[PDB]
Structure formats: structure tokens, C-alpha cells
Amino acid sequence: ALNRGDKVRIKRTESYWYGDVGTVASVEKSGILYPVIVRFDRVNYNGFSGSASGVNTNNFAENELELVQ
Amino acid sequence: SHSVKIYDTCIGCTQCVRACPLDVLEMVPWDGCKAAQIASSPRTEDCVGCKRCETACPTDFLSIRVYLGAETTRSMGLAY
Amino acid sequence: MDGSYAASYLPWILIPMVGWLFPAVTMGLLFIHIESEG
Amino acid sequence: TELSGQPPKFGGSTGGLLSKANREEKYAITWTSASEQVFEMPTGGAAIMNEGENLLYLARKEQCLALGTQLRTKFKPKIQDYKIYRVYPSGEVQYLHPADGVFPEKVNEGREAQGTKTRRIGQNPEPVTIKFSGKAPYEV
Amino acid sequence: MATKFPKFSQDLAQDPTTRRIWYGIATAHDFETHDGMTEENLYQKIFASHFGHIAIIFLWTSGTLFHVAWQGNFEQWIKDPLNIRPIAHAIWDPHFGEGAVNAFTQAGASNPVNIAYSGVYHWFYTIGMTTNQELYSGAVFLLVLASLFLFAGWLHLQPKFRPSLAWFKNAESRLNHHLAGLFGVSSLAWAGHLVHVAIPEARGQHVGWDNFLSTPPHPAGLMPFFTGNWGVYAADPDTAGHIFGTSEGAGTAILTFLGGFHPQTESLWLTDIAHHHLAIAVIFIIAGHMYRTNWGIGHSIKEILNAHKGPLTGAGHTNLYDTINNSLHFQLGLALASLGVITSLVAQHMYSLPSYAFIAQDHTTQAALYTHHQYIAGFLMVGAFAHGAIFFVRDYDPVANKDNVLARMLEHKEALISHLSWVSLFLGFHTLGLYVHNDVVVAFGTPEKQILIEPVFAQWIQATSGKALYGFDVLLSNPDSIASTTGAAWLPGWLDAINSGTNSLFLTIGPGDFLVHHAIALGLHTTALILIKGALDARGSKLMPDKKDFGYSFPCDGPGRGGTCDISAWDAFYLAMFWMLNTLGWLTFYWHWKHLGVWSGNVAQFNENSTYLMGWFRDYLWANSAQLINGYNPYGVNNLSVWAWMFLFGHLVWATGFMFLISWRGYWQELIETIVWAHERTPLANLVRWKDKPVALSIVQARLVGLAHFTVGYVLTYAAFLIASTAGKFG
Amino acid sequence: ADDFANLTPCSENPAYLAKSKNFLNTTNDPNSGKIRAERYASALCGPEGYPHLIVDGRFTHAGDFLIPSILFLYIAGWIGWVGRSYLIEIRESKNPEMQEVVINVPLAIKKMLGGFLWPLAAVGEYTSGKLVMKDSEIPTSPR
Amino acid sequence: MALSDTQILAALVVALLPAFLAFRLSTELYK
Amino acid sequence: MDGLKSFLSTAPVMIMALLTFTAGILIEFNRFYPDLLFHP
Ligand code: CLA
Ligand code: CLA
Ligand code: CLA
Ligand SMILES: CCCCCCCCCCCCCCCC(=O)OC[C@H](COP(=O)(O)OC[C@@H](O)CO)OC(=O)CCCCCCCCCCCCCCC
Ligand SMILES: CCCCCCCCCCCCCCCC(=O)OC[C@H](COP(=O)(O)OC[C@@H](O)CO)OC(=O)CCCCCCCCCCCCCCC
Numbered sequence A: 001a002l003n004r005g006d007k008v009r010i011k012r013t014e015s016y017w018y019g020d021v022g023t024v025a026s027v028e029k030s031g032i033l034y035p036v037i038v039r040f041d042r043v044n045y046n047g048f049s050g051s052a053s054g055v056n057t058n059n060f061a062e063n064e065l066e067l068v069q
Numbered sequence B: 001s002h003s004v005k006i007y008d009t010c011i012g013c014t015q016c017v018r019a020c021p022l023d024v025l026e027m028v029p030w031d032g033c034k035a036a037q038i039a040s041s042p043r044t045e046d047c048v049g050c051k052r053c054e055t056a057c058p059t060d061f062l063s064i065r066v067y068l069g070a071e072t073t074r075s076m077g078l079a080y
Numbered sequence C: 001m002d003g004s005y006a007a008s009y010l011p012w013i014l015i016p017m018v019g020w021l022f023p024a025v026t027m028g029l030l031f032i033h034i035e036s037e038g
Numbered sequence D: 001t002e003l004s005g006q007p008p009k010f011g012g013s014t015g016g017l018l019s020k021a022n023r024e025e026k027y028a029i030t031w032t033s034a035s036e037q038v039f040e041m042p043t044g045g046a047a048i049m050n051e052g053e054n055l056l057y058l059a060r061k062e063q064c065l066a067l068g069t070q071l072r073t074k075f076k077p078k079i080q081d082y083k084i085y086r087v088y089p090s091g092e093v094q095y096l097h098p099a100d101g102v103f104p105e106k107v108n109e110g111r112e113a114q115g116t117k118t119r120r121i122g123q124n125p126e127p128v129t130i131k132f133s134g135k136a137p138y139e140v
Numbered sequence E: 001m002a003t004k005f006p007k008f009s010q011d012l013a014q015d016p017t018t019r020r021i022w023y024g025i026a027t028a029h030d031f032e033t034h035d036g037m038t039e040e041n042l043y044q045k046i047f048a049s050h051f052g053h054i055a056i057i058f059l060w061t062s063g064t065l066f067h068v069a070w071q072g073n074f075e076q077w078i079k080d081p082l083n084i085r086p087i088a089h090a091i092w093d094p095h096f097g098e099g100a101v102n103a104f105t106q107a108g109a110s111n112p113v114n115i116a117y118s119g120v121y122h123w124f125y126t127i128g129m130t131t132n133q134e135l136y137s138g139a140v141f142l143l144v145l146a147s148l149f150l151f152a153g154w155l156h157l158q159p160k161f162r163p164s165l166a167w168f169k170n171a172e173s174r175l176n177h178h179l180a181g182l183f184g185v186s187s188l189a190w191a192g193h194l195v196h197v198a199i200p201e202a203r204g205q206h207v208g209w210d211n212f213l214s215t216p217p218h219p220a221g222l223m224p225f226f227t228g229n230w231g232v233y234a235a236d237p238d239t240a241g242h243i244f245g246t247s248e249g250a251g252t253a254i255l256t257f258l259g260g261f262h263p264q265t266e267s268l269w270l271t272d273i274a275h276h277h278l279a280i281a282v283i284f285i286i287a288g289h290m291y292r293t294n295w296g297i298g299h300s301i302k303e304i305l306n307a308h309k310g311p312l313t314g315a316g317h318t319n320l321y322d323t324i325n326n327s328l329h330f331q332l333g334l335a336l337a338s339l340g341v342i343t344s345l346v347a348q349h350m351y352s353l354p355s356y357a358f359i360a361q362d363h364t365t366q367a368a369l370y371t372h373h374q375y376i377a378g379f380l381m382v383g384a385f386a387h388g389a390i391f392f393v394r395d396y397d398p399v400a401n402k403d404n405v406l407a408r409m410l411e412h413k414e415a416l417i418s419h420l421s422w423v424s425l426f427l428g429f430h431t432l433g434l435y436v437h438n439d440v441v442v443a444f445g446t447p448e449k450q451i452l453i454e455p456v457f458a459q460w461i462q463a464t465s466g467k468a469l470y471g472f473d474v475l476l477s478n479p480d481s482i483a484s485t486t487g488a489a490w491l492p493g494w495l496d497a498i499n500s501g502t503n504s505l506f507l508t509i510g511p512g513d514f515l516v517h518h519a520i521a522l523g524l525h526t527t528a529l530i531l532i533k534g535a536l537d538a539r540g541s542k543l544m545p546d547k548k549d550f551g552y553s554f555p556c557d558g559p560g561r562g563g564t565c566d567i568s569a570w571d572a573f574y575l576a577m578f579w580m581l582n583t584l585g586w587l588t589f590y591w592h593w594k595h596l597g598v599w600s601g602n603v604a605q606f607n608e609n610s611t612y613l614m615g616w617f618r619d620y621l622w623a624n625s626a627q628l629i630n631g632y633n634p635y636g637v638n639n640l641s642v643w644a645w646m647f648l649f650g651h652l653v654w655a656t657g658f659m660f661l662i663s664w665r666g667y668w669q670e671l672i673e674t675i676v677w678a679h680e681r682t683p684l685a686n687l688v689r690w691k692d693k694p695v696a697l698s699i700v701q702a703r704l705v706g707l708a709h710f711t712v713g714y715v716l717t718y719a720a721f722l723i724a725s726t727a728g729k730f731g
Numbered sequence F: 001a002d003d004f005a006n007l008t009p010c011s012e013n014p015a016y017l018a019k020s021k022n023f024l025n026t027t028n029d030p031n032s033g034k035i036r037a038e039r040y041a042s043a044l045c046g047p048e049g050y051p052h053l054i055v056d057g058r059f060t061h062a063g064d065f066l067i068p069s070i071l072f073l074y075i076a077g078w079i080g081w082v083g084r085s086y087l088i089e090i091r092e093s094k095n096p097e098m099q100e101v102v103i104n105v106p107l108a109i110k111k112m113l114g115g116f117l118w119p120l121a122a123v124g125e126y127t128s129g130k131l132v133m134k135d136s137e138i139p140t141s142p143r
Numbered sequence G: 001m002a003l004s005d006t007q008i009l010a011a012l013v014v015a016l017l018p019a020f021l022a023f024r025l026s027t028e029l030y031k
Numbered sequence H: 001m002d003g004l005k006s007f008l009s010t011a012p013v014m015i016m017a018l019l020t021f022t023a024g025i026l027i028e029f030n031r032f033y034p035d036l037l038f039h040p
């Protein structure tokens, strides 16, 4: 039900942004276990040691998101 | 040997297979992501444990995990 | 080396035994046990 | 069967095979080359691959795979037909790479899925719930 | 194929490298990970291991007693304890030369000998032992005791006598028998020994196995104990002129409470000690009747813990009986924390309120005892927190402990860790700033601008116990206070011992003590921050949200995600070990410098120079080393040869630990590969081949080995310095 | 009456007087030693001759710790508050990070100057503002 | 006094007993 | 130009400027009013 621009909180526990806020970029069609693409402002940990930033996008499911605006 | 598990949070970007230096991983067909594929670990007896597959993984916390187990000549990377 | 205490002949041979014989025997037994079967 | 190919032109080195190749196991890389070229040896120093077939014996599988990546990423006509086998002291040969004639980077039918967990990472069972067993969260 | 050793781990037995050896030694006691271990067999093996350990303690004690009897001068030491130094045992070393022999024929011995430094002589003397034959029979009896416990441990592994799991998990009955029987009855028996033997021997009345049934320790028998007139037993206590071992100043009292110190021996009165033991025996026997067993009457720990719910906490202490009773790491961490606290307590109470005769004069033995027990306490505390983290890794159940105290501690772990970080930064910043200010101020020839802040709170606390030096007149320092006019038989002796600046009871403190207590606070805060952060993130963090899946100890998680070196809770233990050693170093430096000042009467040096750190660098370390580093020199050898050699030995071991700590595996694996190449290609040596493939030490093994060398060196070098300085100065 | 019997005023301590007769000049002032010897004779000294400071809390020694504490608390609250409000205003500039590396000088100076009222704006934000944040809206790690 | 010559080499026979029992306990715990 | 001001407004330049300014403040304060251990 979530659309583009939906500010949402991540509930994946193991996620780096669990409790943080991210904006939805797109929702892939049915069939995929994690279609909700969420982009973030704070980069995560990904990258080899000493690298610059990290990854600021990940795919989740509807059940793993709490809706804000 | 080491265990190399793959989870349903796989997006099938094939980066961990490209990063593997001992051909432990494969890209098998799947239906859980857009790329319609998933990673697999058929040749785990050749895993050394260099964690490169995890380094090349994009998902928020890795979908592929390497757990270091019983050491052998192949896992210790010995040429002697 | 000497000793006004009684049985001063006991350390005479007991110091080499604790320092040479006992360690060599225990290390040899443990070495054989480490490298057993194959 | 019988591995074929000319050995690369090499003057020798101290980084090659040791007693393991004859006591334990060895590995082999074969590849066809469009011309006599110079490549880097995974064991140190430069060697010359012949035009046509080349067979080279190495001590460890990662060495053959490093040679394969170099063949496929460092030459103008990319060498990607390379094959990697494992040789045992009884002369037995086990074909290894690429497993199903196709590189594992790209999907190919016929491959089973192993080590695949239906659950999420954070959905592993708590260790206390599986203690006094011979298993770990990532195994049940 | 299999290489047999270790039988308890096929993952190791099939390791074809030298690691198989090392790890086989490193995981033998971790019974929980043995192949096919069950909880019941775990407990039974632990039971037998406990029996073996008790036998080992008894054997070591028997060794102490036997060597003191055989090669000591105990009977000569009793004739003149204040001048004759006690000897631990004789030396027999063929490496010795004439100089070393002449140097170590000391303390009136006809052969090379080491002088005792553990105060066991004062112990045995205050206990009532006066001959060599008594020590000998004690050693033999303890041999028999070790034998009994060894046979018990053998018996409890037989199918005919194996305690079951439910028996091991009987917390109520075990607590009852330990509080009432193990603790209470034993303090009762020790009071009985002090009454029948120790006190009569202190007055010159020989009480042995040949006469203890005939001579009552009091002119009145057990009727004053039977009826109720217990003051008969206070009778005439030992006068302030009682000379130890004789009848001069002697009395008939067996239970007093005058407090203070024996005027000659400078220790607690034996009658007060036996009285303390009697009271504590009664208290412990009363405690050991709290929990029900088989007679319905009594408490159950589970219901008490379940009842303590609450509003803001939530589940409270519900299900904590099962939480603690099913996890042995939880029990071990509780035991280790408690025992480390009370070991530090013993250390703090033995130097200040000594209990063995004439041990206050033997300054080296007291320094060594304080250092030893504070180091034991530091080790026990680190181990307690390590086992707490191990519980979190292996045994923690989130659903059975949901919303309880444990789950909430984990739920706001960021607050706890961050506030520990704040208090540590606070303490360190400001204490180091004050020390550096004092140093820079003294350096420029203007020592008047030092920030000297009086330890007002602790001086006030001393005054509350009757200390009138600072003129506080508060509580027991004020005669007009209600607490000081209660008629307690312990007030006069206590005030006389605390207001005579001649012993080690409540030592006068200056601003330097304030600075060093803040340094100690920094050390404790930072070590505890390391340990708590390790235990709370042991189950996971934001780098490894599944760190519990990998176990308590693993190398790392790779260079990915930025780099994950020293990630496990084991790495937190290994980090905290350095800060614990540093905290104990600060402790022992403070204690030893202040006590050297106290013993030499020149407290001015410590009180005036402990404020800037150059004072510690030149007046404590550099100065007291002068004797030690001359135990042997181009001119000969004195009795400090072993201590100087061991000082340098500890330096060497410490640096060798640095070796493993700074340089990390892969470099060494490549080097070892070149050496393997060398061996395979060198003739004649080719006749020989290794059975285990040589490989570099593992990452966790390297941390453990570097830390082991670091700690060995730390302890040995500081022990050498302590002993040599305090013994060459004689305090 | 007889409080701190171990210490005596520096004027009444002979060691302090003897040492202050030879105090060293600090700056170019040849009387810097003399004025230091005159200023430190006020406090309590120890048997050695150096002044001890009393943080007991009594207002007779309010300058030993209370006044420097108040001064530093004010100034450090100023620093923290101006930095925090600068970071928060940076938060809404599309590119906040490169303004955290490259310091917006005018905005920084405007935040800094308006810092003398930090202890009042602090309770202003605490009463119904953004000073304290709800725990459930803060990112945490797995327990 | 001083310990008897015959007395020192009498404790060793008694020590033979805990040696035997520790050997038994070790071998049983290895099982 | 604008880039010169942006360079003059970087983190190291601003931090060293503030540190030097505060250094001057404190040095002059202790020069004219020295040896201020405590407030009378
Ligand atoms: C743990 C107790 C202990 C310790 C640390 C020592 C220490 C020492 N002893 Mg002594 N000893 C002990 C108990 C002990 N003794 C007992 C109980 C006896 C009477 C049976 C003796 C009788 C004895 C003699 C006759 C002599 C020594 C001697 C020595 C010195 C060299 C060792 C040796 O050659 O003799 C070896 C010791 C024995 C044969 C006795 C067995 C020791 C006990 C019974 C067993 C200890 C087991 C214990 C658990 C340690 C195991 C190791 C540990 C890692 C588990 C050494 C400093 C020599 C000496 O005088 O030096 C100058 C020597 O002449 N000991
Ligand atoms: C009254 C009956 C009784 C008594 C005598 C004991 C006795 C003992 N039990 Mg047992 N047990 C009992 C019944 C009893 N049990 C019951 C009913 C159960 C449950 C069904 C258990 C189940 C149980 C288990 C599972 C275990 C024990 C263990 C132990 C031993 C504890 C460890 C130890 O030896 O340190 C001795 C401790 C003390 C003497 C207390 C010291 C007081 C503290 C430390 C302060 C020190 C004070 C003082 C200053 C120290 C002196 C210093 C000196 C140098 C001057 C101990 C000897 C453990 C063991 O070792 O197995 C054999 C163990 O694993 N018990
Ligand atoms: C003298 C050696 C030393 C120093 C100064 C520190 C410093 C610190 N350690 Mg550390 N540690 C050390 C040894 C040392 N460690 C060793 C050998 C180990 C074993 C590997 C550890 C392992 C360790 C762990 C595991 C932890 C610490 C922690 C800390 C911090 C706690 C804050 C504090 O203590 O108070 C305040 C700080 C200090 C006293 C030191 C800084 C003071 C300087 C001089 C201020 C001036 C800065 C300077 C002007 C900057 C400009 C320099 C310019 C010229 C280039 C702190 C910054 C704990 C922590 O991080 O707490 C949150 C933490 O968990 N340490
Ligand atoms: C007595 C004198 C002491 C001599 C000690 C010499 C230490 C030698 C250490 C070896 C590394 C040195 C090479 C560094 C180059 C290097 O690569 O180092 C190693 C490290 C590289 O880390 P990474 O591998 O993660 O970097 C890869 C990145 O490029 C990713 O793209 O760089 C750093 O240390 C960052 C810290 C910079 C610290 C910034 C402070 C700036 C200081 C300003 C003042 C300079 C001094 C002026 C002269 C007075
Ligand atoms: C002296 C130590 C120096 C500083 C160390 C750090 C002190 C920590 C204080 C920070 C504030 C704690 C926040 C509590 C958070 C909080 O309020 O939780 C809520 C809690 C409500 O508990 P309940 O009413 O549910 O109690 C029922 C219980 O049976 C179940 O827990 O409050 C209390 O427990 C009472 C007061 C808190 C007691 C906290 C203990 C803190 C230790 C202080 C020193 C202990 C000494 C014990 C000696 C016997």
C-alpha cells in the first residue's frame, strides 16, 4: 500500500537502519519477498576497510516497515 | 571446512560469486528477487574463509554468511 | 650444594629426576599420544 | 582422462610444487592462447604461454583460479576457455572449474540450490534453544 | 582418517596442522563443546574436577607445611620473630657458584635457602603451632585429605554413585548446607580451635592431642555456656602487658570484645577473633535454615524471585530461578564477582587490621600479601565479566526472561555504555590534567602553584570512626556524640589503635591520595566499561547483528563492513585485561610508596611528591630500584641476585608478549612457508619430516599468547621489584 | 572552631613563609613572585608549605572550586549549545555534510554570538521542544 | 627439634597414595 | 575569490584560528593577572 515518498521506519532488527527513517523509492510487483525499495540518508557499513561511504538503499517487505510521512 | 549459507534476502547481483577466489559459490535459478536467481555454496570444501563474498554483498547486513569451521589443508590455504 | 637438614641425599638425585627424567618421560608420552593412529 | 597441452615456457622457480603434489594432491590449469604471450606466474615471476594449448600444474586451487582471472581480465583476446582440475597421486583427475561448463557468475539451468536458508538472517534460532546439540543457529 | 587427539573434538582431530595440538590444549576444560556432551555428564565431570582441585589445594598446602618443617627455622624463628627472617625452603641448584652459595646461605642456615615472604610463619604461630612435628603431622594429614577427596571424585563418576541432574539443580538444599554447614559449622570449629589451642598457646599453655580432653580452656566448664552466664568467659582478658608465648599478663578469658591491637604482636586479640568466629557461626547457621527441602517449612527461591514484580521495571525477577539454575556461566560469574570483591576486601583488611602475631613488623611479607590478593581479585573480576558475556552468548533466553531485569539491562545497553564512556572520559581527562598541571608547575621551579585538593570526604569518614587528627569532631571523633557514649567494649581499644600514628590502621591521607584514588576510579570505570560493553554487545551489535551465532570467541568477521578486528566478547575480555593490570599497577604503586614512607617514618616524601608524576618516576620507581639492580654486578652477588634476574626475566617476557601483540598472523604464515620450503629442499634434513604441518598461530591464539606473556612479565617484574626493594630497605 | 586541624593558614605556616621569601618571578614583573607570595598567604597550607584547596562546598572557599565550576559550566554550555544548534540548522541545507566539513562562517558566527542565553534556551527546548527525543524513534542495535 | 632422617622418607610412601588416587581420577575423567 | 573564502572556512583553518585566538586570550590573561590558583 506504500507509495513513493513514504517516510518509514525499518523493523528488521538486524538492519543498520532499525529505528531510523528512510524514504520509499519504488515498490516492485508481487512475487518478490522483499520488493519495497527504501533509500536512506545515513550510509550503512558496506565497503572494504578504509573505503569512503556505504550503501544507502535496501529492499524490505511491507511487514518490516512502519509508516510515517 | 567452513559453512557458507545464503538467505532469502538475496537480490541476485552475482557479486559474491565474482569475488570468490576459490570457486565455492554458484548462481542458481530462484524466484524470490528481480534477477530471478540466488547464491549457492556447492563447493564448500574449497572455502578458505577470506570473507570476500561478504565484502561484495550489498544487502543491509549480508545475505551470504561464512562461518569458520574445522580446518583442513584446503581451508588453511596450505601449498605444502 | 649441601644441606644440614636430614636426608640431604634426597635432593641430590631428586632434582635431576624432577628436572630431567620426569619431564623427558612426560613429554615423550604426550608426544606419542599427540601423534597416535596417524 | 589424460590432460593435454604444452607446458608454459618457464625457467623454473622455488615457489612451485612441493612434496604435497606427490603425497597429497595437485591442480592443473589448461587454456588455449591466440599467440605466444607473457603472463605472470601465481608463484612469482613471469612465464610465456604458448600459442595453442597450455597445461600448467599448480599446488593449490586458488592459484589456478588466480591464473584464470588473469587470463580472462588482462589480455586483449580474453582467455576464458580455461579449465581447472584436481590431480591425485594415483593419477586420478577430477574436473573442477567451471563446474557445469558455464562460469558460476551467470545463472544456468540444471544447478541445485545448496546452503540456501528459507528464513532471514535475524530469524536464526537462539543458541539456548539448541544447546547440548551438535548444531549452531545457521545449521538447523 | 583421525589423529585421535583430541578425543573430544573431531573438528580438531582431523586438523592436519600444528593448530590441532594448540587448540587441543585450549578447549579441554570447555566441557560444553565436547562431542556429544550432555548436561548431566557435564555436571558429573565438573563434580569430579572439583574433587581433584580440592585435592590439589590440599597437596599444595601440605607442601608448604612440609617444606617449612623440613627446611625451615620455625622453632628458631619463634625464639626471636622480630629479627630472624623466616625461610620458605632450601635451595639445591647445580648451576650455583661459590658467590651464589655464600649469598644464599642466609637467615642462619647452613645451606643455600630462600627466605619466606608469604607470612605463613606468623599464621602458623598465631594459630598455636610451636614445633616442627606439628607442621609435619599437618602435612601428612593433608596428604590423607587430598587422598580422600581424590577417592570421592573417583567414586562420583561410577554408575553406582553418579549424582543426577535434578540433584545438581537443587539450589535450596545446597544453599542451606553451604550457609549452615560449610560456612557456619566451620567458623564454629575454628572458634573452638582458637579457644582450645591458639589462645592457651598464646599464654604458654601447651594444648596438644595428648591433653586437650583433660584441660578445659576456661576455669569454668560448659555450664556458663549451658545456663547463660556468658560473661564468665570474658573473665580477665589479656592485659596490655601480655608478652606472647608466656604467662606474663595472661588471663583466663576465652571470649572478649575489647577491639584494638595486641600491644606486642600488633594484631587483633585472639579472644576477639574466636568471639567473632562464634558469632559468625551462629549467624551462618541461622541463615542456613531459610530455604525448604523435604519438610515443607521454608522458602523457595523461585517464588521469592517471581513475587518481586513492579511498575517501572516490569517482569521484575520472574523466572530468574531457572535463568540462574540452568546456566553454569551465570553461577560462575556471580561466584567470581563476589569472590573477587571479598578477596580485595581481605587484602584491604589484612594490611590495616592484621591478625597474625608480629606480621605488622614484617613489611615485605605484608606488601607481597596485599599485592598478591589484589591481583587475585582483579583476575576474578575479569573472569566474572567474561562469564557474564559467555552466559549472554550461550545461555541467555529472551522469551523466558522477557521484560525482566536482564532484558531491560540489554534494552538500554547504549545508555549504560555511553554513560560509562562519559564517566571514564571525565575521570581520565581531569585526573591526567591535574597531574600534568602539577608536573609542569613543579618543573619551572614554582612548586607553589600545584593543585592540591584535600581528600575531605575520606578524612571525614576516618573521623566518623574516631580519628581526631583532622579535628572534625563528628560521630566517634566527638566524645559528646550519642554513638560514642553507648558503653561498647570495643570503643577504647578501637580509638587507641586508630589515633596512634604507629600502625597501618586508617592511614592519614593528603591530596596525593585524592589524586591516586581518582586514578583508581578511572581504572575501575574504564575496565568495567570494556567488560560491560563486551557482555552487552556479545549477542550482537550493528556490525554483527548475529554475533551470538558465531560464539563467544572467534577471530573476527573480516575486513568488510569497514573492518571487524577484536569484535567478539572474548576480545573485550582480552582488552580489559590490560586495563585491569594497569589498575592493579596503580593500586600497588600507591600502596607500596605510601607504605615505604610510613615504614621509614619519612611520609613527607610521599605526601609532597605523589602529586606530580615525576615524583612517582624518580622517588618511587627509580629510587627503590637501586638495591634490586645490584643483586649482581661486576663486583659480586648479594641475596638479591634471583630478584634482579627475575626482574629482567619479566621485562623480557613482557616484550616478547609485545611481539605477538603488534605483529599479526599472515606475515608469520608467509615466513613459515619459506622455512617449510627450506626444510623440504635441504639434504640430510630431508630424511626427517614433520608429522603436523607447521602453521602460524591463529588470531585468537596470538592475542591469548601475547596477553599471557604480557601478564607473566607484569606480575613477575613487579613482584621482583616489590620484594627486592622492601627487603633491601627492610621497610 | 578546630576544623582541619592538620592544616594551618599559609601566613601561619613557617615553611610557606620561608619558601615565599624566594618565590620565582613568573612574567616580566619583578614583583610577580612577591604578589604571588602575598596572594597565596590567604589559603590553607600544609606542613610542606604549599597551599591545599578545599572543595568541601563551604562558601568560605567558594573560589577554590565553586566559581571556576560555575564559569566553566557557563562557557561549556555555550560551546555545546552553539555547536548543537549549528549542526541542527545544518541538517536542513540539502548538503549538510559538506557544510559540516566546510564551516558556514556567517551562520556559525550568528549561532555563536547568540549563546549567552544558552541556559534559558535549554529549558525552553526541554519544556516542549527538541532537546530530548523519544526512545522508540532512535535507531538501536539488536539485543 | 629437627625432622628425623627416617621421618622425611616416610611421607613419600604416604604420598604414593594420593599419587595412585590422582592417577585413577585422571584416567576416569579421561573416559 | 569565493574558493579562497571557502578554503579559509574549512575545518582545519577555522579550528586552528579559534585555538590560536583562545591561546592568545588565556596567555594574556595569565600575563597581566598571573598565579591565579583560586578566587579570593
Ligand atoms: C605442591 C606441593 C609441593 C611443592 C610445590 C614442592 C616443591 C619442591 N620440593 Mg617438595 N614435597 C612435597 C610437596 C611439594 N614440594 C611433599 C608433600 C613431600 C613429602 C612427600 C615433599 C618432599 C620432597 C623431597 C624429598 C624433596 C622435595 C623437593 C622440592 C623442590 C624440588 C622438587 C623435587 O625435586 O621434589 C619432588 C617432590 C616430591 C617427590 C613429592 C611429591 C609432591 C606432592 C606429594 C605432589 C604434588 C602434586 C601437585 C598437585 C603438583 C602437580 C603439578 C601441578 C601442575 C598439578 C621443590 C622446590 C626437593 C628439595 O628438597 O629441593 C631442594 C627434595 O629433596 N620435596
Ligand atoms: C553441610 C553439607 C555439605 C558440605 C559440608 C558441603 C561441602 C562442599 N561442597 Mg556440597 N552439597 C551439599 C552438601 C554439602 N556440601 C548439598 C546438600 C548439595 C545439593 C544437593 C551439594 C552440592 C554441591 C555441588 C554441586 C558442589 C558442592 C561443592 C562443595 C565444596 C565447595 C567448594 C570448596 O571446597 O570450597 C570450600 C569453601 C569454604 C570452606 C567456604 C569459605 C568461605 C569464604 C570463601 C570466605 C573465606 C573465609 C576465611 C577468611 C577463609 C580462610 C582463609 C585461611 C587461609 C586463613 C565443599 C567442600 C562443589 C565441589 O567442590 O564439589 C566437590 C560443587 O561442585 N556441593
Ligand atoms: C597512556 C596510555 C593510554 C591512554 C592515554 C589511553 C586513552 C584512553 N583509553 Mg585506552 N588502552 C590503553 C592505553 C591508553 N589508553 C592500552 C594499552 C589498552 C590495551 C589495548 C587500552 C585499551 C582501551 C579500551 C578497550 C578502552 C580504552 C579507553 C580509553 C579512553 C577512555 C577515556 C579516559 O580514560 O579518560 C580520558 C582520556 C585520556 C586521559 C587520554 C587523552 C588525553 C589527551 C592528552 C588530551 C589531549 C588531546 C590532544 C591535545 C589532542 C591534540 C594532539 C595534537 C598535538 C596532535 C581514553 C581516551 C576506553 C574508552 O574508549 O572509553 C570510552 C575503552 O573502552 N582503552
Ligand atoms: C618521531 C617521528 C615519528 C615518525 C612516525 C612515522 C609514522 C609512519 C606511519 C606509516 C604511515 C605513514 C603514511 C601515511 C599515509 C597512509 O596511507 O597512512 C595509512 C592510512 C591509510 O588508511 P587506508 O588504507 O584506510 O586508506 C585508504 C583510502 O585511501 C581509501 O581510499 O592513512 C592514515 O593513516 C589516515 C590518517 C591521516 C592523519 C591525518 C593527520 C594529518 C597530519 C597533518 C600534519 C602532518 C605533519 C607535518 C610535518 C611536521
Ligand atoms: C554509588 C554508585 C556510584 C554511581 C554508580 C551508578 C549508579 C546508577 C544510578 C543511575 C540511576 C539508576 C536508574 C534506575 C532506573 C529505574 O528507576 O528503574 C525503575 C525502578 C522501579 O522498580 P520497581 O518498583 O519495579 O521494583 C521492583 C523490583 O523488585 C523489580 O525490579 O526503580 C527502582 O528500581 C528504584 C530506584 C532505582 C534503583 C537503581 C539502582 C542503581 C544502583 C545505584 C547504586 C546501588 C547501590 C546498592 C547498594 C545496596
Ligand SMILES: CC1=C(/C=C/C(C)=C\C=C\C(C)=C\C=C\C=C(C)\C=C\C=C(C)\C=C\C2=C(C)C(=O)CCC2(C)C)C(C)(C)CCC1
Binding pocket: E061, E065, E134, E135, E138, E139, E141, E142, E189
Ligand atoms: C564425641 C562428641 C564430642 C566430642 C568430640 C571430641 C572429643 C573431639 C572433637 C574434635 C574435633 C571436632 C576436631 C576437629 C579437628 C579438625 C582439625 C584438627 C583440623 C582441621 C584442619 C584442616 C582442615 C586443615 C588444617 C591445616 C593444616 C593441617 C595445618 O597444619 C595448617 C593450617 C591448615 C592449612 C588450615 C562433643 C562432646 C564435642 C559433641 C558430641 C560428640
Ligand SMILES: CC1=C(/C=C/C(C)=C\C=C/C(C)=C\C=C\C=C(C)\C=C\C=C(C)\C=C\C2=C(C)CCCC2(C)C)C(C)(C)CCC1
Binding pocket: F055, F056, F057, F076, F077, F078, F079, F080, F081, F084, F118, F122, F131
Ligand atoms: C555542587 C557540589 C558538588 C557536586 C554535586 C553533584 C553530585 C552534582 C550532580 C549532578 C548530576 C547527578 C547530574 C546528572 C544529570 C543529567 C543530565 C541529563 C544533564 C545533562 C543534560 C543535557 C540535556 C545537556 C544539554 C546541553 C546543554 C544544556 C549545553 C551544552 C549542550 C548540551 C546538549 C550538552 C561537589 C561535591 C562536586 C562539590 C560541592 C557541591
Ligand SMILES: CC1=C(/C=C/C(C)=C\C=C\C(C)=C\C=C\C=C(C)\C=C/C=C(C)/C=C/C2=C(C)CCCC2(C)C)C(C)(C)CCC1
Binding pocket: E329, E330, E331, E333, E334, E337, E338, E341, E384, E385, E387, E388, E389, E391, E392, E535
Ligand atoms: C555481566 C553479567 C553478569 C555479571 C555481572 C557482574 C560481574 C556484576 C558486577 C559487580 C559487582 C562486584 C558489584 C558489587 C557492588 C556493591 C554493593 C552491593 C554495595 C554494597 C553496599 C552497602 C549497603 C554498604 C554499606 C555499609 C557501609 C557503607 C560501610 C559500613 C558498613 C555498611 C554495611 C553499613 C551475570 C553473570 C551476573 C549475569 C549475566 C550478565
Ligand code: SF4
Binding pocket: B006, B009, B010, B011, B012, B013, B014, B015, B016, B017, B038, B039, B053, B056, B057, B058, B059, B062, B063, B064
Ligand atoms: S552478493 Fe549477496 S545479495 Fe548479491 S547474489 Fe551474493 S548473496 Fe545474493
Ligand code: SF4
Binding pocket: B004, B019, B020, B021, B022, B023, B024, B025, B046, B047, B048, B049, B050, B051, B052, B053, B054, B066
Ligand atoms: S569465504 Fe572466500 S572462499 Fe569462502 S565463499 Fe566467501 S569468498 Fe569464497
Ligand SMILES: [Ca+2]
Binding pocket: E128, E129, E130, E201, E206, E207, E208
Ligand atoms: Ca603445642
Ligand SMILES: [Cl-]
Binding pocket: E632, E633, E634
Ligand atoms: Cl651485571
